[PDB]
Subunit: 228 residues, 3 copies
Amino acid sequence: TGRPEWIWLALGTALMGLGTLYFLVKGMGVSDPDAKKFYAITTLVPAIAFTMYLSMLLGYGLTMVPFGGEQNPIYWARYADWLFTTPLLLLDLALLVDADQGTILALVGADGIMIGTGLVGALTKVYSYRFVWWAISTAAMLYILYVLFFGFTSKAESMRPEVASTFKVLRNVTVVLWSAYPVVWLIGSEGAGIVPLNIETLLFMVLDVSAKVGFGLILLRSRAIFGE
Amino acid sequence: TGRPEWIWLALGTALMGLGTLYFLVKGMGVSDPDAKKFYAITTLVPAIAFTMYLSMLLGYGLTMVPFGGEQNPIYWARYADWLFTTPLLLLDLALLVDADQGTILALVGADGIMIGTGLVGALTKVYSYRFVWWAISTAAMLYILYVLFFGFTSKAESMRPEVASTFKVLRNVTVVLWSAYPVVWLIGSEGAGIVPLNIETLLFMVLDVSAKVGFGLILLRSRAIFGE
Amino acid sequence: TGRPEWIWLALGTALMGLGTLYFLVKGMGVSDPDAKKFYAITTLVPAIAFTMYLSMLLGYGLTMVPFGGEQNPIYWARYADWLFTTPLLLLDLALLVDADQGTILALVGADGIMIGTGLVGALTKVYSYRFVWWAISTAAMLYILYVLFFGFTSKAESMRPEVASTFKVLRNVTVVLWSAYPVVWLIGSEGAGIVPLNIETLLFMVLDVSAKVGFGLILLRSRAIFGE
Ligand SMILES: *C/C=C(C)/C=C/C=C(C)/C=C/C1=C(C)CCCC1(C)C
Ligand SMILES: *C/C=C(C)/C=C/C=C(C)/C=C/C1=C(C)CCCC1(C)C
Ligand SMILES: *C/C=C(C)/C=C/C=C(C)/C=C/C1=C(C)CCCC1(C)C
């Protein structure tokens, strides 16, 4: 339940808060329109994560879900976080490669399904069913990764070489980090429970900070965010 | 409760899933920007419906609401579905006639009110009050239908004849199908309960598949989605 | 609990409904694209508020929250209202000064955090924690007010003098009214409880009608909404 993992929740809260402040201050020295958008998007991501990590730390974002004949602690606040932060991260990537509206909607929509079905799975009372939702959510994730490689990368090359290289790195970072989430879910408290909640929380914290703060540091330090 | 109607929920799940896959594959042979948008929007609709129909089939999207001195089974997942799919359908229509941002916001906003108030009515514990919400939701629906005829049709004519004819058909399809929803709600388990949940579920399934898959088939088979 | 304050909820419901109808009818005599947007945005605000005020009046938007060792009545419907109406009001201001996408996203995002954290605070079971959320929400509000003065006003001056003057008035109206909300929350039933729910409801009603209907009357009566 909500106790051993408190340290990872506290560290997550602190790291997201610090990241938000760093991006906020760093963005003060920016007036370029396009550069503005990237800062706005990128700073909102850890700001949201900060509030949800704090909600979990304080116990608000935690609930008990019956399944497997047991009362299992489930941090639902994560999904509220991801619901808004994952599409924002996708928007950063899309804006970078100047994706068309159609592809953006496809990505945001698939992302919404990924998080929504993940939440349904996390709160499902029938054990076996939890994995059905996991599969559907994973399929949505694969769709997103597909678009990022066969509907994005190809266009990034048709853009400025500075944009292409920054997109390629952020793209690779996204694919590696995002793909780890379903694995942690599958092995953790929400899934088969091979890994305890304490360790599951630690894993998500490392992933979240990297996917948000790490991702943001790479993007906001790049010249790709400016139109030159 | 959740049993007799299982067959309609299973059929709905299957039909939405098949529709989503068909649109997904069909869209692979498309590269045109504007055509892209229509495929993205139209494929997301049954994809979302698929997840919610499955949630109902598995029992997750079902809840018990006390009213009329009874414990009434209410499938709340429908509203989660409609909250996102109805405005997407409206966006398809709006994009088709190249509606201005102002009208799109008006439609999306009215739609949000329609579904939101429908949900409030569906979960209201005071019988007589349920119909007050039904009336407000219906008023919002009438607003939407009004705009589609006196704020859309008139412009579709000012566009390409291919767009005008496809819009006219989809418009007519929308008006006929959407108008049936409040009637089913009024006579079904959420309303006066003249029709049993089993039959109510069947009716919504026929309406949903037609309004989503049927609607999509007409749109995506049209040349109106391309700019020529 | 839900009784003495019924009159303020009924008055709020009536005033929001009347405002919505007035804006609806007034907007009929408009065809200008940009003018359209302002009417669509501005009419949706009181329309949404109307539904939520009615939900509170009927008892649906009310819930009991345990804290301070007591069962405290909390009208959660307010946050559902504000979640959608505050960013819409910000959009009116942003459209007026032709703000760039980056700033709009920053405002909408900060607003989402403001309302979200306010809701978390309103439903928190640990008394002292409620004020932590209040502080975070207030910080988000201050960010919004900052942008409206150092990221908006400066640009409004670079626009038509009619737009600048209307923005300045609406800006001032927004800053004064919005700043009162955290104070009412802090002194009312959601906070330290120095003011009874009855009076708290009255205060929010006066603020809401002014910030929505009053704000709208000023905007929609202005020539600033037209491009000339
Ligand atoms: C800041 C957070 C980030 C970048 C979060 C990313 C989350 C995902 C890619 C989550 C994916 C999931 C699945 C593919 C299946 C099971 C449910 C989820 C939600 C863990
Ligand atoms: C895929 C789903 C579609 C096109 C659904 C459409 C739903 C409506 C037009 C629903 C309308 C309702 C009312 C007018 C009043 C009562 C509540 C609703 C939600 C059944
Ligand atoms: C129609 C409603 C309007 C313009 C509402 C405005 C609401 C705010 C500025 C609310 C702010 C809050 C805080 C700064 C802290 C405590 C929580 C709130 C939600 C009362």
